[PDB]
Design a protein around this nucleic acid. Sequence first.
RNA 1: GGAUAGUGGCCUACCAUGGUUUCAACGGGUAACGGGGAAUAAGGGUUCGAUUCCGGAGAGGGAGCCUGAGAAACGGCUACCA
RNA 2: GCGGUAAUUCCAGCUCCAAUAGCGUAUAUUAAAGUUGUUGCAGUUAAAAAGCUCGUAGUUGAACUUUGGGCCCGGUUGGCCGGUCGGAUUUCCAACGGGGCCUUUCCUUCUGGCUAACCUUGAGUCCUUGUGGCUCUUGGCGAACCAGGACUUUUACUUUGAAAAAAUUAGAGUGUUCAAAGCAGGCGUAUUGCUCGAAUAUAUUAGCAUGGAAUAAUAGAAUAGGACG
RNA 3: AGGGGAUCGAAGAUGAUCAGAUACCGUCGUAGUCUUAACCAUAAACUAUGCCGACUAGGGAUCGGGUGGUGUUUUUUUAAUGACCCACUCGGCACCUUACGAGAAAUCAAAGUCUUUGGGUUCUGGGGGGAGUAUGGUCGCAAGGCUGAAACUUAAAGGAAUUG
Lengths: 150, 144, 87, 129, 81, 155
Amino acid sequence: GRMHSAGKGISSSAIPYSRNAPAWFKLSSESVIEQIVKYARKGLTPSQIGVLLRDAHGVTQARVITGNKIMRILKSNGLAPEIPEDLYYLIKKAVSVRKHLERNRKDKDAKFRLILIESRIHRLARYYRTVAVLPPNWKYESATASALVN
Amino acid sequence: GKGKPRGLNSARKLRVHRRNNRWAENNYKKRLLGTAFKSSPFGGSSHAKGIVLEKLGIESKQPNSAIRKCVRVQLIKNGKKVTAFVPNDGCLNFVDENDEVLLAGFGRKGKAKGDIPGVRFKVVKVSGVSLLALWKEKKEKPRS
Amino acid sequence: MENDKGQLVELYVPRKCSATNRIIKADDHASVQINVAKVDEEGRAIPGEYVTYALSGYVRSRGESDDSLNRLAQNDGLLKNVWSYSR
Amino acid sequence: TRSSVLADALNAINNAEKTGKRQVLIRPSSKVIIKFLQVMQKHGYIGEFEYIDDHRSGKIVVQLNGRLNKCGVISPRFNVKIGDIEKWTANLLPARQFGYVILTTSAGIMDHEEARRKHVSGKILGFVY
Amino acid sequence: VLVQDLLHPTAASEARKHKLKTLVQGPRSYFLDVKCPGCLNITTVFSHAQTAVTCESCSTILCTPTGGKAKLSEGTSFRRK
Amino acid sequence: STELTVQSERAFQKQPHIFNNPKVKTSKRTKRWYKNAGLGFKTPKTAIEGSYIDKKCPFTGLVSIRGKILTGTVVSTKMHRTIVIRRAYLHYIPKYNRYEKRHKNVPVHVSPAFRVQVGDIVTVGQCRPISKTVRFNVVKVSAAXXXXXXXXXXX
RNA sequence: GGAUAGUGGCCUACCAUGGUUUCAACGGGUAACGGGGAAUAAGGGUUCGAUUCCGGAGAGGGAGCCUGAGAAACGGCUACCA
RNA sequence: GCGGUAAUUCCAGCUCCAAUAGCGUAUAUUAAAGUUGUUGCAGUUAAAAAGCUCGUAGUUGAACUUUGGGCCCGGUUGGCCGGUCGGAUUUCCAACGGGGCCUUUCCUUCUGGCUAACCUUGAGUCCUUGUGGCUCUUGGCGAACCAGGACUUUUACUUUGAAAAAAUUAGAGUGUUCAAAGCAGGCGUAUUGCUCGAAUAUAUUAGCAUGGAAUAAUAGAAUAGGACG
RNA sequence: AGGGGAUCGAAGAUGAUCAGAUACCGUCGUAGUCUUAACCAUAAACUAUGCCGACUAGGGAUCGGGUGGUGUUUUUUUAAUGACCCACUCGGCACCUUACGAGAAAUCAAAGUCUUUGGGUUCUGGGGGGAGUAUGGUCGCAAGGCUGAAACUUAAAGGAAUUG
Ligand SMILES: [Zn+2]
């Protein structure tokens, strides 16, 4: 599909049939979960942390060695942020873009991309709000967006 | 799927879109808008009767070349005025001006018949007696 | 295609391609019939004895009749290796 | 996005039949597809199919013979009021003597005939001949 | 063609295609233990970095990422699984 | 609705005839009358515990639940002791053999024995005309508040 | 509370600010009384129904009311307009 | 489309054709018409893709959660026989469904009112070497629905049924001499009655009642403010 | 509404030409063309072909990313980098050949899987002319944009292909 472009690419992660294993893996859930929460105190996103734990560390996927997903670990140990990760980075981008436009209003393309990013934001938040995790009132506005990050 | 919403619940969209598209059907548009009652020289009625105003002789459309005898009639029901052909051979003889002829359509719904331009009606019953019984020899023209 | 009290009715029970089981009818002059001689021990090839195959017009045009021969006439016995069902 | 998988699978079986192949890689798989194919082989328009298990939605491999002209899906799964099965079979079935309309009743995903005997009805899935 | 084995595809050409297009999809990424003689202790590394991985106790280097697999830091060695 | 005051009208609010005597020393102050509407609608605790008056209250008033018994979603709670609920449904059109979305907003009296908000799927029972547009009375709040506390904050 | 045979903004007094709406409100149109029905025959439809059966409305227009079980009647009265 | 001097269309004679106590005509309507297209149209060039993207309403929307095995019960066709004085039923026997089962398996739930149902049996047997057979009270099945307390995630769908004026309609019987109709009529002992009828069906949306549990929605325990006791 | 105004150049003025030549051609040259601030919202704005999804056929290129090589070429000492080669696979802008298939045809990897007629959804069309006209509404400074009839008239209009 791909919404705000008709670019029909395929570029994901093929998950193994091995919902268990790695079999070549020692350690325990203990070690790697401490790794998760400690890196979380270090201030990293579940995606960031997942990539880190996937490279330098020996964690193919942190959902199998530990029966719980990273963001859920963070929630479990009280490390979850104000808003979910994706909504955060969408909004953040939107804010930088907006600043770019308020630096030169002659860029029509920029206004386009801002419209798009914001539409994406609103759809997303409408979902999150449907599922109780965004407060039933929660809405995006620029004049609180540039504040929302900080 | 060529547009048309196939969902099990889009009934409204389909009937609405129907109505919508149906308005481009001439006979339906006509039947609803009024026309037959608005426009049209008769009342939408099958026939209508009026007075002969003047005896006309219409030059016929191409590639035909003759003169088609008719009458201008002012309908008694509504005073509208309509030029209507007199069928058969002669029969412009049977009429005279200032009479009371009964007119009908030309089996075309509006639409001029043959090579008779702008004439969408015909004589069917002059002065009370039938034009047919007059053209054969059955009946004869009333009083005066 | 029988009738009431049993009994065969309706003439002509058409051929059939060995490769696709697609019915073979009259105007399909693209169909084919392949006679394979049922040979005997050391050399000789018995006439009046054929492994007879039928390959409908479609397949012949697609150009799969060769591959359908390596398919059929090999696991029918008369070829070894040559074609592998795994690809 | 994929609207109705059953439709896709049936189109795949059909294009398979036409193209001359005997094996159908269909994807993804579901209970509805399974039951459909199951009432398809039960009257023998296909050989046997193999559910291969990717840990996601599934895969199926249908070995078909070629007795099948065309199978299909009535996507708007209209409701059928016991009198209307006759009408549907009348619609898309080549003759009375064969071919079967297959539909979903509260008694299961069954062909029109079993549906007739069991005296049950419901929505409609598609057809096979 | 016209007939083949979908259930049993030759490994020779099951390994040419895409990671999602195989019979049952899976990754083409391997994990490898990586060693530098500076230390007596090896380090587990994923083949497509993104993150420029650092070593054991010696903050030296191991790999800097690329368009795909991670370039290794020259004077090192590595073993799969 | 009501809340507080109870006696908050130019005329005294008393249930008819339900007399209690000042000579008779009491710990209950006012003797109370109640019933059950029937149809297995358990007369709610707050109706007997209550202090209100509502003569249109099905459990502690002078109306009767009979006829149709319906259910619907609450779209409006503004008018005092009365709400507006939206019953949706599908209408079968044969020509296209498809069901089309439709709805109706029934005005229904709600006793101060309930705590209704917008959303609470609710069950009401027909009665007499009590108003210009009222013919039903809320007789079971099936829902709750739709997991409203679930949307909170942090720690 | 009043009024009704009786429910009810039916009406009045106070009070509140509510009620319908693109799932089409409200408004316009109708050469529209509604239904049983009718015409056209693959099916799906289409068109029609003033009219012998049921239900409604009127007795030139409007309102008012007497009598009475029952009428806002009209082969009842009263007033106004034509 | 015929007529401007050999008119197969006009005016007539003659002959002839179709329809026939009837035939023309005008208007409208339906069929034709897959030219309104849910079934079932069409949209590159013939009518017709909005210059483009966003996007609310609307329509639509991946897959996954009781799958599989064994035992009984009785109803209906249909098959060789007939046990007979056109039709009867056992069993030999496949076919086709339905009811309850036990497989880790709420059926709302207590409290008895009903127990028909059997692991029951109490003496055995009319009687085929007996598990073929059921009259027969005493330890002993809850649902079979009662009456009363106590609580229940909401639906679409389909099933059977109740409720459903007649005329109409589809349609059974009856020879108004026939037919359209009508609901009559038919019988001896036609000098003192005998008698069959006046059926069935449709009655589609919505309300009620009920059987289903697939398809498709819905609600649930994550700041556990969970589940039972 | 300022700036800017080289260039070329609607208007206009001219020299030609033709019977006429308000043109075609030449000379002059206003506006315009550039620009900033605001309008306008139309183009054969065209691939005259809605978007998402599945399936259906072989080929040589080439763009972008990756993979695989005791491959070439670059030498510094063997490399490392960098271009080139071959293979393979994604997502492209394209072509080539074929037709299972499709169409009235021209033609079409869709314009295919479609009377053996149902994946999802948006839009438009219903003989020609009248006519994008009239009327109302809204938008615009304006020119004009959107929305958009009817009376009447008409047997054709039109598409693709063939021979002349
Ligand atoms: Zn190191």
